[PDB]
Protein: Oleoyl-acyl carrier protein thioesterase 1, chloroplastic
Amino acid sequence: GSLTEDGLSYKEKFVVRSYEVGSNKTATVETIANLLQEVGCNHAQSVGFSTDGFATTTTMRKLHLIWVTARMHIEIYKYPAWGDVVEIETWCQSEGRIGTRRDWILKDSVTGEVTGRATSKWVMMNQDTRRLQKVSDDVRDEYLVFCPQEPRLAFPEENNRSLKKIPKLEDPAQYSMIGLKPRRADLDMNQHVNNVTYIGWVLESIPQEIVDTHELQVITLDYRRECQQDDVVDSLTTTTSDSQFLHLLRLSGDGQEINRGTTLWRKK
Amino acid sequence: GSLTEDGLSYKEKFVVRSYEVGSNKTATVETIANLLQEVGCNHAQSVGFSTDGFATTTTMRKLHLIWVTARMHIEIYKYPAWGDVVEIETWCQSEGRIGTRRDWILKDSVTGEVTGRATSKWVMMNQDTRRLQKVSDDVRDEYLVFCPQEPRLAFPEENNRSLKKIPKLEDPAQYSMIGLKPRRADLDMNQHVNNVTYIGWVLESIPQEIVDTHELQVITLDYRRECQQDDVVDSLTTTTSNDSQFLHLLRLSGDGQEINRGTTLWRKK
Ligand SMILES: CC1=NN(c2ccccc2)C(=O)C1
Ligand SMILES: CC1=NN(c2ccccc2)C(=O)C1
Ligand SMILES: CC1=NN(c2ccccc2)C(=O)C1
Ligand SMILES: CC1=NN(c2ccccc2)C(=O)C1
Structure:
Protein backbone atom coordinates (compact mmCIF):
# COMPACT_ATOMS: atom_id res chain seq x y z
CA GLY A 1 0.00 0.00 0.00
CA SER A 2 0.97 3.66 -0.40
CA LEU A 3 -0.21 7.29 -0.24
CA THR A 4 -1.16 8.48 -3.78
CA GLU A 5 0.95 11.08 -5.73
CA ASP A 6 -0.66 14.15 -4.05
CA GLY A 7 -0.47 12.48 -0.56
CA LEU A 8 -4.19 13.22 0.07
CA SER A 9 -5.47 9.61 -0.22
CA TYR A 10 -4.14 6.05 0.27
CA LYS A 11 -4.35 2.93 -1.99
CA GLU A 12 -3.85 -0.77 -1.21
CA LYS A 13 -4.40 -4.04 -3.13
CA PHE A 14 -5.78 -7.27 -1.64
CA VAL A 15 -6.07 -10.81 -3.07
CA VAL A 16 -9.34 -12.43 -1.86
CA ARG A 17 -8.61 -15.53 0.36
CA SER A 18 -10.31 -18.97 0.46
CA TYR A 19 -11.77 -18.49 3.98
CA GLU A 20 -12.97 -14.91 3.13
CA VAL A 21 -15.67 -16.06 0.63
CA GLY A 22 -19.31 -17.09 1.14
CA SER A 23 -21.62 -19.61 -0.60
CA ASN A 24 -21.37 -17.69 -3.93
CA LYS A 25 -17.53 -18.12 -4.04
CA THR A 26 -17.19 -14.30 -3.61
CA ALA A 27 -16.04 -12.16 -0.66
CA THR A 28 -18.60 -11.60 2.14
CA VAL A 29 -19.62 -8.01 3.14
CA GLU A 30 -17.74 -8.62 6.46
CA THR A 31 -14.54 -9.48 4.51
CA ILE A 32 -15.07 -6.21 2.56
CA ALA A 33 -15.65 -4.20 5.85
CA ASN A 34 -12.43 -5.69 7.42
CA LEU A 35 -10.48 -4.64 4.26
CA LEU A 36 -11.92 -1.07 4.61
CA GLN A 37 -10.63 -1.08 8.25
CA GLU A 38 -7.18 -2.39 7.17
CA VAL A 39 -6.73 0.26 4.43
CA GLY A 40 -7.89 2.99 6.90
CA CYS A 41 -5.35 1.80 9.49
CA ASN A 42 -2.50 1.80 6.92
CA HIS A 43 -3.50 5.37 5.81
CA ALA A 44 -3.31 6.57 9.48
CA GLN A 45 0.14 4.88 9.95
CA SER A 46 1.49 6.42 6.72
CA VAL A 47 1.04 10.00 8.05
CA GLY A 48 1.76 9.49 11.78
CA PHE A 49 -1.63 9.05 13.52
CA SER A 50 -2.44 6.14 15.93
CA THR A 51 -2.94 2.68 14.39
CA ASP A 52 -5.55 1.28 16.81
CA GLY A 53 -8.56 2.23 14.62
CA PHE A 54 -8.99 5.59 16.44
CA ALA A 55 -6.51 7.70 14.26
CA THR A 56 -5.64 10.04 17.20
CA THR A 57 -3.11 12.94 17.43
CA THR A 58 -0.72 13.46 20.46
CA THR A 59 -3.12 16.27 21.59
CA MET A 60 -6.07 13.81 21.54
CA ARG A 61 -4.09 11.14 23.43
CA LYS A 62 -3.27 13.54 26.30
CA LEU A 63 -6.98 14.62 26.57
CA HIS A 64 -8.19 10.98 26.39
CA LEU A 65 -10.04 11.53 23.02
CA ILE A 66 -10.77 9.06 20.23
CA TRP A 67 -12.64 9.00 16.90
CA VAL A 68 -15.54 6.51 17.01
CA THR A 69 -17.82 5.28 14.15
CA ALA A 70 -21.34 6.82 14.20
CA ARG A 71 -22.52 5.52 10.76
CA MET A 72 -21.15 3.05 8.18
CA HIS A 73 -22.69 2.90 4.63
CA ILE A 74 -21.51 0.30 2.09
CA GLU A 75 -22.75 -0.24 -1.52
CA ILE A 76 -21.37 -3.25 -3.47
CA TYR A 77 -22.01 -3.74 -7.25
CA LYS A 78 -19.75 -6.81 -7.68
CA TYR A 79 -18.24 -8.90 -4.85
CA PRO A 80 -14.69 -10.03 -5.82
CA ALA A 81 -14.16 -13.79 -6.30
CA TRP A 82 -11.49 -16.02 -4.56
CA GLY A 83 -8.08 -15.14 -5.98
CA ASP A 84 -9.23 -11.80 -7.41
CA VAL A 85 -7.18 -8.65 -6.74
CA VAL A 86 -9.22 -5.67 -5.46
CA GLU A 87 -7.75 -2.16 -5.14
CA ILE A 88 -9.15 0.14 -2.44
CA GLU A 89 -8.63 3.95 -2.26
CA THR A 90 -9.47 5.87 0.95
CA TRP A 91 -9.45 9.46 2.13
CA CYS A 92 -10.84 11.61 4.94
CA GLN A 93 -12.62 14.91 5.11
CA SER A 94 -13.56 17.17 8.01
CA GLU A 95 -17.30 18.01 8.39
CA GLY A 96 -17.16 21.21 10.44
CA ARG A 97 -17.56 20.79 14.19
CA ILE A 98 -19.85 17.68 13.76
CA GLY A 99 -17.09 15.14 13.05
CA THR A 100 -15.12 13.61 10.21
CA ARG A 101 -15.87 11.38 7.25
CA ARG A 102 -13.82 8.52 5.78
CA ASP A 103 -14.67 7.42 2.21
CA TRP A 104 -13.59 4.38 0.16
CA ILE A 105 -13.72 3.27 -3.52
CA LEU A 106 -13.27 -0.43 -4.38
CA LYS A 107 -12.10 -1.33 -7.90
CA ASP A 108 -11.38 -4.56 -9.75
CA SER A 109 -7.58 -4.56 -10.42
CA VAL A 110 -7.88 -6.16 -13.87
CA THR A 111 -10.80 -4.14 -15.33
CA GLY A 112 -10.31 -0.82 -13.51
CA GLU A 113 -14.12 -0.72 -12.94
CA VAL A 114 -15.63 0.53 -9.65
CA THR A 115 -17.12 -2.53 -7.90
CA GLY A 116 -18.10 -0.82 -4.62
CA ARG A 117 -18.08 2.34 -2.51
CA ALA A 118 -18.34 3.21 1.18
CA THR A 119 -18.67 6.18 3.52
CA SER A 120 -18.47 6.44 7.30
CA LYS A 121 -19.23 9.26 9.77
CA TRP A 122 -17.00 9.54 12.87
CA VAL A 123 -17.48 11.59 16.06
CA MET A 124 -14.99 12.58 18.79
CA MET A 125 -15.49 10.98 22.21
CA ASN A 126 -13.68 10.77 25.56
CA GLN A 127 -12.60 7.07 25.78
CA ASP A 128 -13.37 6.90 29.56
CA THR A 129 -16.63 8.86 30.07
CA ARG A 130 -18.05 7.95 26.59
CA ARG A 131 -19.13 11.64 26.30
CA LEU A 132 -19.15 13.07 22.79
CA GLN A 133 -17.74 16.51 21.99
CA LYS A 134 -17.62 18.96 19.11
CA VAL A 135 -14.29 19.11 17.24
CA SER A 136 -11.99 21.97 18.41
CA ASP A 137 -10.11 24.30 16.00
CA ASP A 138 -6.71 22.94 17.08
CA VAL A 139 -7.81 19.26 16.78
CA ARG A 140 -9.04 20.00 13.22
CA ASP A 141 -6.07 22.04 11.86
CA GLU A 142 -3.87 18.96 12.59
CA TYR A 143 -5.89 16.88 10.06
CA LEU A 144 -6.39 19.58 7.35
CA VAL A 145 -3.01 19.05 5.58
CA PHE A 146 -3.80 15.26 5.10
CA CYS A 147 -7.26 15.75 3.48
CA PRO A 148 -8.47 17.18 0.13
CA GLN A 149 -9.55 20.85 0.44
CA GLU A 150 -12.32 20.78 -2.19
CA PRO A 151 -15.13 18.23 -1.48
CA ARG A 152 -14.40 14.71 -2.66
CA LEU A 153 -17.27 12.33 -1.91
CA ALA A 154 -17.74 8.64 -2.60
CA PHE A 155 -21.54 9.36 -2.62
CA PRO A 156 -22.04 12.74 -4.31
CA GLU A 157 -25.71 12.33 -5.60
CA GLU A 158 -28.04 14.80 -3.79
CA ASN A 159 -30.46 12.98 -1.43
CA ASN A 160 -28.49 9.67 -1.60
CA ARG A 161 -28.94 6.47 0.55
CA SER A 162 -25.92 7.21 2.87
CA LEU A 163 -27.62 10.21 4.52
CA LYS A 164 -31.18 8.83 5.07
CA LYS A 165 -32.57 8.83 8.65
CA ILE A 166 -33.22 5.31 10.07
CA PRO A 167 -36.36 4.66 12.16
CA LYS A 168 -36.62 2.35 15.21
CA LEU A 169 -37.97 -1.17 14.55
CA GLU A 170 -41.27 -1.71 16.45
CA ASP A 171 -42.04 -4.97 18.32
CA PRO A 172 -42.93 -7.62 17.18
CA ALA A 173 -39.99 -8.10 14.75
CA GLN A 174 -40.72 -10.25 11.65
CA TYR A 175 -37.42 -12.21 12.14
CA SER A 176 -34.89 -12.57 15.00
CA MET A 177 -31.65 -14.23 16.09
CA ILE A 178 -31.39 -14.13 19.90
CA GLY A 179 -28.52 -14.68 22.36
CA LEU A 180 -25.58 -13.55 20.15
CA LYS A 181 -22.30 -13.33 22.14
CA PRO A 182 -18.81 -12.25 21.00
CA ARG A 183 -15.86 -14.66 21.27
CA ARG A 184 -12.14 -13.65 21.42
CA ALA A 185 -11.86 -13.62 17.58
CA ASP A 186 -14.53 -10.82 17.58
CA LEU A 187 -12.31 -8.53 19.73
CA ASP A 188 -9.69 -6.03 18.54
CA MET A 189 -6.20 -5.39 20.06
CA ASN A 190 -7.84 -3.14 22.74
CA GLN A 191 -10.29 -5.99 23.73
CA HIS A 192 -13.31 -4.09 22.33
CA VAL A 193 -15.83 -5.75 19.91
CA ASN A 194 -14.64 -5.07 16.31
CA ASN A 195 -17.04 -2.78 14.34
CA VAL A 196 -17.47 -5.50 11.69
CA THR A 197 -18.91 -8.09 14.23
CA TYR A 198 -21.98 -5.79 14.56
CA ILE A 199 -22.51 -6.03 10.74
CA GLY A 200 -22.45 -9.84 11.07
CA TRP A 201 -24.90 -9.75 13.99
CA VAL A 202 -27.28 -7.49 11.98
CA LEU A 203 -27.18 -10.00 9.07
CA GLU A 204 -27.82 -13.02 11.39
CA SER A 205 -31.56 -12.24 11.50
CA ILE A 206 -31.98 -12.23 7.65
CA PRO A 207 -33.66 -15.55 6.68
CA GLN A 208 -31.43 -18.09 4.85
CA GLU A 209 -33.94 -18.05 1.90
CA ILE A 210 -33.10 -14.38 1.22
CA VAL A 211 -29.34 -15.07 1.45
CA ASP A 212 -29.77 -18.00 -1.01
CA THR A 213 -31.86 -16.06 -3.62
CA HIS A 214 -30.50 -12.50 -3.24
CA GLU A 215 -27.25 -10.55 -3.03
CA LEU A 216 -26.70 -7.75 -0.52
CA GLN A 217 -26.44 -4.47 -2.43
CA VAL A 218 -26.53 -1.73 0.30
CA ILE A 219 -26.11 -1.71 4.12
CA THR A 220 -26.37 1.43 6.31
CA LEU A 221 -25.64 0.90 10.00
CA ASP A 222 -25.86 3.46 12.91
CA TYR A 223 -23.68 2.76 16.01
CA ARG A 224 -25.10 4.04 19.35
CA ARG A 225 -23.44 1.98 22.08
CA GLU A 226 -20.94 -0.85 22.51
CA CYS A 227 -21.58 -4.48 23.21
CA GLN A 228 -19.17 -5.29 26.07
CA GLN A 229 -17.15 -8.57 25.99
CA ASP A 230 -19.74 -10.01 28.49
CA ASP A 231 -22.98 -8.58 26.96
CA VAL A 232 -25.55 -10.68 24.96
CA VAL A 233 -27.25 -9.30 21.84
CA ASP A 234 -30.61 -9.85 20.06
CA SER A 235 -30.76 -9.12 16.33
CA LEU A 236 -34.15 -8.09 14.92
CA THR A 237 -35.34 -7.64 11.30
CA THR A 238 -38.62 -6.61 9.55
CA THR A 239 -39.22 -6.34 5.79
CA THR A 240 -40.05 -2.76 4.70
CA SER A 241 -40.78 -3.64 1.01
CA ASP A 242 -35.62 -5.60 -4.61
CA SER A 243 -36.12 -6.54 -0.93
CA GLN A 244 -35.49 -3.98 1.87
CA PHE A 245 -35.25 -4.57 5.62
CA LEU A 246 -35.14 -2.53 8.85
CA HIS A 247 -32.77 -3.81 11.58
CA LEU A 248 -32.25 -3.36 15.32
CA LEU A 249 -29.53 -4.79 17.63
CA ARG A 250 -30.33 -4.52 21.34
CA LEU A 251 -28.88 -5.94 24.58
CA SER A 252 -30.74 -9.20 25.54
CA GLY A 253 -31.61 -8.15 29.03
CA ASP A 254 -32.92 -4.59 29.24
CA GLY A 255 -33.55 -4.13 25.47
CA GLN A 256 -31.06 -1.20 25.31
CA GLU A 257 -30.36 -0.22 21.66
CA ILE A 258 -26.82 -0.73 20.40
CA ASN A 259 -27.43 -0.35 16.61
CA ARG A 260 -30.08 0.29 13.97
CA GLY A 261 -29.80 -0.16 10.20
CA THR A 262 -31.28 -0.89 6.77
CA THR A 263 -30.28 -3.44 4.06
CA LEU A 264 -31.25 -3.58 0.32
CA TRP A 265 -31.02 -6.94 -1.52
CA ARG A 266 -31.31 -7.61 -5.27
CA LYS A 267 -32.48 -10.96 -6.78
CA LYS A 268 -29.52 -13.08 -8.05
CA GLY B 1 2.56 -17.67 -3.89
CA SER B 2 4.23 -20.42 -5.92
CA LEU B 3 5.33 -24.08 -6.02
CA THR B 4 9.05 -24.31 -5.03
CA GLU B 5 11.82 -25.22 -7.56
CA ASP B 6 11.30 -29.02 -7.30
CA GLY B 7 7.44 -28.62 -7.43
CA LEU B 8 7.06 -30.78 -4.27
CA SER B 9 6.05 -27.97 -1.85
CA TYR B 10 4.36 -24.53 -2.01
CA LYS B 11 5.37 -21.14 -0.49
CA GLU B 12 3.35 -17.97 0.14
CA LYS B 13 3.97 -14.67 1.97
CA PHE B 14 1.43 -12.79 4.10
CA VAL B 15 1.51 -9.34 5.71
CA VAL B 16 -0.25 -9.46 9.14
CA ARG B 17 -3.40 -7.20 9.16
CA SER B 18 -4.73 -4.81 11.84
CA TYR B 19 -7.89 -6.90 12.56
CA GLU B 20 -5.84 -10.17 12.66
CA VAL B 21 -3.97 -9.32 15.91
CA GLY B 22 -4.85 -9.86 19.58
CA SER B 23 -4.09 -7.96 22.83
CA ASN B 24 -0.31 -8.49 22.38
CA LYS B 25 -0.36 -6.64 18.96
CA THR B 26 0.60 -10.00 17.33
CA ALA B 27 -1.38 -12.44 15.15
CA THR B 28 -3.85 -14.74 16.99
CA VAL B 29 -3.52 -18.58 16.64
CA GLU B 30 -6.82 -18.46 14.62
CA THR B 31 -5.25 -15.95 12.16
CA ILE B 32 -2.27 -18.36 11.87
CA ALA B 33 -4.65 -21.41 11.31
CA ASN B 34 -6.60 -19.48 8.56
CA LEU B 35 -3.25 -18.68 6.84
CA LEU B 36 -2.33 -22.42 6.98
CA GLN B 37 -5.73 -23.15 5.30
CA GLU B 38 -5.13 -20.44 2.62
CA VAL B 39 -1.62 -21.71 1.71
CA GLY B 40 -2.98 -25.31 1.57
CA CYS B 41 -5.79 -24.21 -0.78
CA ASN B 42 -3.33 -22.38 -3.09
CA HIS B 43 -1.05 -25.49 -3.15
CA ALA B 44 -4.07 -27.68 -4.24
CA GLN B 45 -5.05 -25.13 -6.97
CA SER B 46 -1.46 -24.97 -8.29
CA VAL B 47 -1.46 -28.69 -9.20
CA GLY B 48 -5.12 -29.20 -10.25
CA PHE B 49 -6.95 -30.58 -7.18
CA SER B 50 -10.25 -29.10 -5.82
CA THR B 51 -10.02 -25.73 -4.00
CA ASP B 52 -12.83 -26.21 -1.44
CA GLY B 53 -10.51 -27.40 1.37
CA PHE B 54 -11.03 -31.09 0.42
CA ALA B 55 -8.21 -31.36 -2.27
CA THR B 56 -10.12 -34.06 -4.26
CA THR B 57 -9.27 -35.78 -7.62
CA THR B 58 -11.90 -36.39 -10.42
CA THR B 59 -11.98 -40.07 -9.25
CA MET B 60 -12.80 -38.94 -5.66
CA ARG B 61 -15.54 -36.55 -6.87
CA LYS B 62 -17.41 -39.28 -8.83
CA LEU B 63 -17.32 -41.46 -5.64
CA HIS B 64 -18.44 -38.53 -3.38
CA LEU B 65 -15.11 -38.86 -1.39
CA ILE B 66 -13.39 -36.00 0.46
CA TRP B 67 -10.32 -35.51 2.70
CA VAL B 68 -11.32 -34.35 6.18
CA THR B 69 -9.09 -33.16 9.12
CA ALA B 70 -8.67 -35.78 11.91
CA ARG B 71 -5.95 -33.95 13.93
CA MET B 72 -4.38 -30.45 13.77
CA HIS B 73 -1.13 -29.72 15.76
CA ILE B 74 0.36 -26.18 15.87
CA GLU B 75 3.50 -24.98 17.69
CA ILE B 76 4.31 -21.22 17.66
CA TYR B 77 7.66 -19.80 18.93
CA LYS B 78 7.00 -16.17 17.87
CA TYR B 79 3.66 -14.71 16.74
CA PRO B 80 4.22 -12.15 13.93
CA ALA B 81 3.34 -8.51 14.72
CA TRP B 82 0.96 -6.18 12.70
CA GLY B 83 2.69 -5.31 9.43
CA ASP B 84 5.21 -8.18 9.64
CA VAL B 85 5.69 -10.44 6.57
CA VAL B 86 5.51 -14.18 7.33
CA GLU B 87 6.47 -16.84 4.77
CA ILE B 88 4.72 -20.23 4.97
CA GLU B 89 5.92 -23.44 3.23
CA THR B 90 3.59 -26.46 2.94
CA TRP B 91 3.73 -30.00 1.60
CA CYS B 92 1.84 -33.29 1.82
CA GLN B 93 2.83 -36.90 2.36
CA SER B 94 0.83 -40.11 2.09
CA GLU B 95 0.76 -42.30 5.26
CA GLY B 96 -0.11 -45.66 3.73
CA ARG B 97 -3.80 -46.54 3.75
CA ILE B 98 -4.42 -44.64 7.06
CA GLY B 99 -4.62 -41.22 5.40
CA THR B 100 -2.48 -38.26 4.44
CA ARG B 101 -0.49 -35.59 6.26
CA ARG B 102 -0.10 -31.89 5.47
CA ASP B 103 2.86 -30.07 7.13
CA TRP B 104 3.72 -26.36 7.38
CA ILE B 105 6.78 -24.24 8.38
CA LEU B 106 6.28 -20.54 9.29
CA LYS B 107 9.29 -18.21 8.94
CA ASP B 108 9.88 -14.51 9.58
CA SER B 109 10.58 -12.98 6.12
CA VAL B 110 13.23 -10.55 7.39
CA THR B 111 15.27 -12.87 9.68
CA GLY B 112 14.73 -16.21 7.89
CA GLU B 113 14.17 -17.82 11.34
CA VAL B 114 11.50 -20.52 11.89
CA THR B 115 8.76 -18.91 14.04
CA GLY B 116 6.29 -21.84 13.96
CA ARG B 117 5.42 -25.25 12.59
CA ALA B 118 2.28 -27.32 12.06
CA THR B 119 1.13 -30.80 11.09
CA SER B 120 -2.30 -32.19 10.30
CA LYS B 121 -3.64 -35.74 9.75
CA TRP B 122 -6.41 -36.20 7.14
CA VAL B 123 -8.71 -39.20 6.50
CA MET B 124 -10.83 -40.05 3.44
CA MET B 125 -14.62 -39.99 4.02
CA ASN B 126 -17.80 -40.28 1.94
CA GLN B 127 -19.31 -36.69 1.93
CA ASP B 128 -22.89 -38.06 2.33
CA THR B 129 -22.71 -41.10 4.65
CA ARG B 130 -19.81 -39.68 6.78
CA ARG B 131 -18.26 -43.20 6.64
CA LEU B 132 -14.47 -43.32 6.67
CA GLN B 133 -12.55 -45.60 4.31
CA LYS B 134 -8.91 -46.61 3.79
CA VAL B 135 -7.11 -45.03 0.80
CA SER B 136 -7.11 -47.18 -2.38
CA ASP B 137 -3.92 -47.71 -4.42
CA ASP B 138 -5.40 -45.84 -7.41
CA VAL B 139 -6.21 -42.73 -5.28
CA ARG B 140 -2.78 -42.86 -3.55
CA ASP B 141 -1.00 -43.04 -6.98
CA GLU B 142 -2.61 -39.78 -8.20
CA TYR B 143 -1.01 -37.80 -5.30
CA LEU B 144 2.46 -39.50 -5.25
CA VAL B 145 3.97 -37.28 -8.01
CA PHE B 146 3.08 -34.06 -5.99
CA CYS B 147 4.71 -35.19 -2.68
CA PRO B 148 8.34 -35.79 -1.56
CA GLN B 149 9.28 -39.50 -1.79
CA GLU B 150 11.69 -39.57 1.19
CA PRO B 151 10.08 -38.54 4.54
CA ARG B 152 9.98 -34.80 5.18
CA LEU B 153 8.39 -33.97 8.52
CA ALA B 154 7.74 -30.67 10.27
CA PHE B 155 7.94 -32.60 13.61
CA PRO B 156 10.74 -35.17 13.32
CA GLU B 157 11.64 -35.46 17.12
CA GLU B 158 11.44 -39.01 18.63
CA ASN B 159 8.69 -38.42 21.27
CA ASN B 160 7.19 -35.23 19.76
CA ARG B 161 3.86 -33.72 21.01
CA SER B 162 1.98 -34.06 17.63
CA LEU B 163 1.47 -37.83 18.03
CA LYS B 164 0.41 -38.05 21.72
CA LYS B 165 -2.96 -39.68 22.53
CA ILE B 166 -5.54 -37.29 24.09
CA PRO B 167 -7.78 -38.51 26.95
CA LYS B 168 -11.46 -37.58 27.51
CA LEU B 169 -12.10 -34.74 30.01
CA GLU B 170 -14.09 -36.04 33.03
CA ASP B 171 -17.00 -34.06 34.54
CA PRO B 172 -16.91 -31.68 36.38
CA ALA B 173 -14.76 -29.43 34.13
CA GLN B 174 -12.64 -26.80 35.94
CA TYR B 175 -13.73 -24.08 33.42
CA SER B 176 -16.48 -23.79 30.77
CA MET B 177 -18.02 -21.54 28.12
CA ILE B 178 -21.58 -22.77 27.34
CA GLY B 179 -24.01 -22.09 24.48
CA LEU B 180 -21.49 -21.31 21.67
CA LYS B 181 -23.21 -20.99 18.25
CA PRO B 182 -21.70 -20.33 14.80
CA ARG B 183 -22.75 -17.27 12.77
CA ARG B 184 -22.49 -16.92 8.93
CA ALA B 185 -18.89 -15.60 9.20
CA ASP B 186 -17.95 -19.00 10.78
CA LEU B 187 -19.11 -20.92 7.67
CA ASP B 188 -17.07 -21.81 4.57
CA MET B 189 -18.20 -21.62 0.90
CA ASN B 190 -19.95 -25.05 1.32
CA GLN B 191 -21.92 -23.74 4.40
CA HIS B 192 -19.98 -26.01 6.80
CA VAL B 193 -18.36 -24.66 10.04
CA ASN B 194 -14.73 -23.68 9.20
CA ASN B 195 -12.13 -25.90 10.98
CA VAL B 196 -10.61 -22.79 12.64
CA THR B 197 -13.93 -21.86 14.47
CA TYR B 198 -13.47 -25.06 16.55
CA ILE B 199 -9.99 -23.80 17.65
CA GLY B 200 -11.66 -20.54 18.77
CA TRP B 201 -14.39 -22.43 20.65
CA VAL B 202 -11.74 -24.59 22.42
CA LEU B 203 -9.89 -21.40 23.54
CA GLU B 204 -13.14 -19.74 24.80
CA SER B 205 -13.04 -21.78 28.03
CA ILE B 206 -9.44 -20.69 28.95
CA PRO B 207 -9.75 -18.05 31.74
CA GLN B 208 -8.89 -14.44 30.73
CA GLU B 209 -6.15 -14.41 33.47
CA ILE B 210 -4.22 -17.11 31.58
CA VAL B 211 -4.62 -15.25 28.27
CA ASP B 212 -3.35 -12.04 29.95
CA THR B 213 -0.26 -13.63 31.65
CA HIS B 214 0.66 -16.40 29.16
CA GLU B 215 1.21 -17.03 25.46
CA LEU B 216 -0.13 -20.11 23.69
CA GLN B 217 2.82 -22.28 22.65
CA VAL B 218 1.22 -25.59 21.46
CA ILE B 219 -2.34 -26.71 20.54
CA THR B 220 -3.29 -30.27 19.45
CA LEU B 221 -6.92 -30.74 18.42
CA ASP B 222 -8.73 -34.01 17.40
CA TYR B 223 -11.85 -33.63 15.15
CA ARG B 224 -14.55 -36.34 15.63
CA ARG B 225 -17.87 -34.83 14.42
CA GLU B 226 -19.14 -31.61 12.86
CA CYS B 227 -21.09 -28.87 14.55
CA GLN B 228 -23.99 -28.23 12.17
CA GLN B 229 -25.03 -24.60 11.34
CA ASP B 230 -27.94 -25.07 13.87
CA ASP B 231 -26.06 -26.96 16.66
CA VAL B 232 -24.98 -25.38 20.03
CA VAL B 233 -21.60 -26.18 21.62
CA ASP B 234 -20.19 -26.29 25.19
CA SER B 235 -16.44 -25.79 25.61
CA LEU B 236 -14.82 -27.44 28.63
CA THR B 237 -11.29 -27.09 30.11
CA THR B 238 -9.36 -28.58 33.09
CA THR B 239 -5.73 -27.80 34.08
CA THR B 240 -3.48 -30.88 33.83
CA SER B 241 -0.35 -29.17 35.32
CA ASN B 242 5.95 -21.86 34.78
CA ASP B 243 4.31 -23.81 31.90
CA SER B 244 0.53 -24.35 32.17
CA GLN B 245 -1.18 -27.28 30.36
CA PHE B 246 -4.90 -27.89 29.81
CA LEU B 247 -7.20 -30.70 28.60
CA HIS B 248 -10.16 -29.62 26.42
CA LEU B 249 -13.50 -31.05 25.27
CA LEU B 250 -16.11 -29.57 22.88
CA ARG B 251 -19.50 -31.30 23.02
CA LEU B 252 -23.01 -30.60 21.67
CA SER B 253 -25.08 -28.70 24.34
CA GLY B 254 -28.00 -31.06 24.34
CA ASP B 255 -26.97 -34.71 24.38
CA GLY B 256 -23.29 -34.12 25.34
CA GLN B 257 -22.07 -35.76 22.09
CA GLU B 258 -18.29 -35.20 21.61
CA ILE B 259 -17.23 -33.10 18.63
CA ASN B 260 -13.56 -32.41 19.60
CA ARG B 261 -10.92 -33.05 22.24
CA GLY B 262 -7.54 -31.34 22.64
CA THR B 263 -4.62 -30.11 24.74
CA THR B 264 -2.97 -26.64 25.00
CA LEU B 265 0.47 -25.64 26.47
CA TRP B 266 1.00 -22.02 27.61
CA ARG B 267 4.25 -20.33 28.67
CA LYS B 268 4.50 -17.30 31.01
CA LYS B 269 4.97 -13.99 29.11
C1 LIG C 1 -10.40 15.01 9.33
C2 LIG C 1 -9.71 13.77 9.78
N1 LIG C 1 -8.71 13.25 9.02
N2 LIG C 1 -8.31 12.05 9.60
C3 LIG C 1 -7.29 11.28 8.97
C4 LIG C 1 -6.93 10.04 9.47
C5 LIG C 1 -5.90 9.34 8.87
C6 LIG C 1 -5.27 9.83 7.75
C7 LIG C 1 -5.61 11.08 7.27
C8 LIG C 1 -6.61 11.81 7.88
C9 LIG C 1 -9.00 11.80 10.77
O1 LIG C 1 -8.86 10.83 11.48
C10 LIG C 1 -9.91 12.96 10.88
C1 LIG D 1 -21.47 7.33 18.18
C2 LIG D 1 -21.14 6.10 18.93
N1 LIG D 1 -20.54 5.06 18.30
N2 LIG D 1 -20.34 4.04 19.22
C3 LIG D 1 -19.79 2.80 18.80
C4 LIG D 1 -20.15 1.63 19.45
C5 LIG D 1 -19.60 0.43 19.04
C6 LIG D 1 -18.67 0.40 18.03
C7 LIG D 1 -18.32 1.56 17.38
C8 LIG D 1 -18.87 2.77 17.76
C9 LIG D 1 -20.71 4.43 20.49
O1 LIG D 1 -20.52 3.80 21.50
C10 LIG D 1 -21.32 5.77 20.26
C1 LIG E 1 -1.01 -37.55 -0.29
C2 LIG E 1 -1.86 -36.36 -0.59
N1 LIG E 1 -1.32 -35.29 -1.22
N2 LIG E 1 -2.29 -34.31 -1.33
C3 LIG E 1 -1.98 -33.08 -1.98
C4 LIG E 1 -2.89 -32.04 -2.02
C5 LIG E 1 -2.55 -30.86 -2.66
C6 LIG E 1 -1.32 -30.71 -3.25
C7 LIG E 1 -0.42 -31.75 -3.21
C8 LIG E 1 -0.76 -32.95 -2.62
C9 LIG E 1 -3.49 -34.73 -0.79
O1 LIG E 1 -4.53 -34.09 -0.74
C10 LIG E 1 -3.18 -36.10 -0.32
C1 LIG F 1 -12.22 -37.55 11.29
C2 LIG F 1 -13.35 -36.57 11.29
N1 LIG F 1 -13.10 -35.24 11.20
N2 LIG F 1 -14.32 -34.57 11.22
C3 LIG F 1 -14.34 -33.16 11.16
C4 LIG F 1 -15.37 -32.46 11.77
C5 LIG F 1 -15.41 -31.08 11.68
C6 LIG F 1 -14.46 -30.40 10.94
C7 LIG F 1 -13.44 -31.10 10.34
C8 LIG F 1 -13.38 -32.48 10.43
C9 LIG F 1 -15.37 -35.45 11.26
O1 LIG F 1 -16.54 -35.15 11.16
C10 LIG F 1 -14.70 -36.77 11.37
Notes: Chain A touches chain B at residues 17-19, 21-23, 25, 28, 30, 34, 37-38, 41-42, 45, 51, 53, 82-83, 179-181, 183-185, 187-191, 194, 196, 200-201, 203-204, 211 (CB under 8 Å). The pocket of W1P (ligand 3) is lined by residues B 43-44, 47, 49, 55, 67, 92, 94, 100, 143, 146-147 (CB under 6 Å). Chain A has two domains: 2-163, 175-267. The radius of gyration of chain A is 18 Å.
